Amino acid sequence: MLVFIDDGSTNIKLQWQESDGTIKQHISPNSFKREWAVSFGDKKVFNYTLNGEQYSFDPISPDAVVTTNIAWQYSDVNVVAVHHALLTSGLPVSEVDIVCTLPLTEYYDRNNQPNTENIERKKANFRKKITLNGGDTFTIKDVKVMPESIPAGYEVLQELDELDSLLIIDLGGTTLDISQVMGKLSGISKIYGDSSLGVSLVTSAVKDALSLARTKGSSYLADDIIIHRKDNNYLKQRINDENKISIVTEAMNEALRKLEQRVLNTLNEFSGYTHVMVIGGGAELICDAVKKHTQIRDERFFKTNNSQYDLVNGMYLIGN
């Protein structure tokens, strides 16, 4: 079994092919607290131990570990998150080989050549031993690494002359990863990583607002509100203090404007790209402003209906 694991700070995305050749996808939010959870009734809890420390998957706790940083790539929580994603995917527990991911600036030196040091640090992290309480964990056999952003442009780069270049803008929870890549993947003009520019800018602001509105929860719940920002009834069902909905929506709106302006300023630093692609969960939030800011003709702008999965799908199309 070979499983493609785009292991992002916010969500693990999995893609893999079944025995009968059908392709499956699974997403798994990285919300874990440093304590075992308690099972009541029909609730199956996932309690893990790694290096003498206990964790549980907990989607609602305000004490869920905040994972919005570079260190997380090689962290213990990462290993828990990836095992948990495997254990909730529907695949039978087993040995597996995996292809995981690194941020551009971790995967590449300033010359756009692999940073074998960091690439190996990544592979070694998945050697850490982990226990699931009252159950068996998958065993992680062979580990290979790919860069983030770039693999998502695979299909599009195929029908692109080697003179054209595609700007792939990957906005995740922690990091803005930008790459400019020549047609047929014949070259890489430029990479760029900003690990202080993520949707967490918004997540963090929404989380604080929710707490003020007496809806104290995890980063995940805050993201859940960002995802449903356009649904006033959803907002009204989730947010406890009915009198403070505008505090959440406006806090969200201001951080979104900040997100936008910061992202657009970053684009000003690229030039000569003929095509523009926007991928990641953040794509939904910035795609209009990007298309507009780049004056790229409609046909040269690329945005899928499942932006969060663009990367892991590309990893699959390439490496499976």
Q: Which stretch binds Mg ion (CB under 5 A): 4-12, 47-55, 112-120, 263-271?
A: 4-12
Query: Comparing C-alpha atoms, which of 149, 148, 161, 173 is closest to residue 29?
Result: 173
Min CB(249)–a copy of itself separation in Å: 16
Smaller CB separation from Mg ion, 198 or 217? 198
Smaller CB separation from Mg ion, 8 or 193? 8
* Residue 3: Cβ-neighbour burial (10 angstroms; 0-12, 13-18, 19+): buried
Among 9, 10, 89, 294, binds a copy of itself (CB under 8 A): 294
Smaller CB separation from Mg ion, 89 or 175? 175
CB 162 within 8 A of CB 184: yes
Burial track 145-171 (b if 16+ CB lie within 10 A, e otherwise): bbbbbbbbbbebbeebeeebbbbbbbb
Rounded CA separation 155/132 (Å):
38
CA 214, distance to chain mean position in Å, is: 28
Strand locations in the chain, DSSP E?
2-7, 11-17, 23-29, 32-33, 47-50, 53-57, 95-102, 130-132, 139-147, 165-171, 176-182, 188-194, 275-279, 301-302
Contacts of 95 (CB under 8 A, 6+ apart): 1, 138, 139, 140, 141
Owner of token pair 């996932």: 46
308 binding partner (options Mg ion, ligand ANP, a copy of itself, none; Cβ < 5 to 8 Å by kind):
ligand ANP
User: Is residue 141 a contact residue for a copy of itself (CB under 8 A)?
Assistant: no
Q: Footprint of ligand ANP on this chain (CB under 6 A)?
A: 8-11, 148, 172-175, 198-199, 203, 223, 226-227, 280-282, 284-285, 308
Ranges within 216-255 binding a copy of itself (CB under 8 A): 216-218, 221, 224, 237-238, 240-242, 254
Say how many residues touch a copy of itself, by CB under 8 A.
88
Strand locations in 212-307, DSSP E?
275-279, 301-302
CA-CA-CA-CA torsion sign (308, 149, 64, 249) = negative
Among 29, 103, 172, 314, binds Mg ion (CB under 5 A): 172
Min CB(57)–ligand ANP separation in Å: 15
139 binding partner (options a copy of itself, ligand ANP, Mg ion, none; Cβ < 5 to 8 Å by kind):
none
Smaller CB separation from a copy of itself, 20 or 242? 242
Q: Which two tokens stand for residue 7?
A: 């292991």
Q: Which two tokens stand for residue 180?
A: 């400019």
Strand pairing report for 188-194 and 176-182: antiparallel
Ranges within 152-171 binding a copy of itself (CB under 8 A): 154, 161-165
Min CB(240)–a copy of itself separation in Å: 6
For residue 16, which phi and psi values (nearest 5 degrees)?
-165, 160
173 binding partner (options ligand ANP, Mg ion, a copy of itself, none; Cβ < 5 to 8 Å by kind):
ligand ANP
Stretch 256-275: interaction string toward a copy of itself, x if CB under 8 A = -xx--xx--x--xxxxxxx-
Smaller CB separation from a copy of itself, 143 or 221? 221
Smaller CB separation from ligand ANP, 5 or 91? 5
Q: Which stretch binds Mg ion (CB under 5 A): 32-40, 125-133, 166-174, 264-272?
A: 166-174
By CB under 5 A, name the binding residues for Mg ion.
8, 172
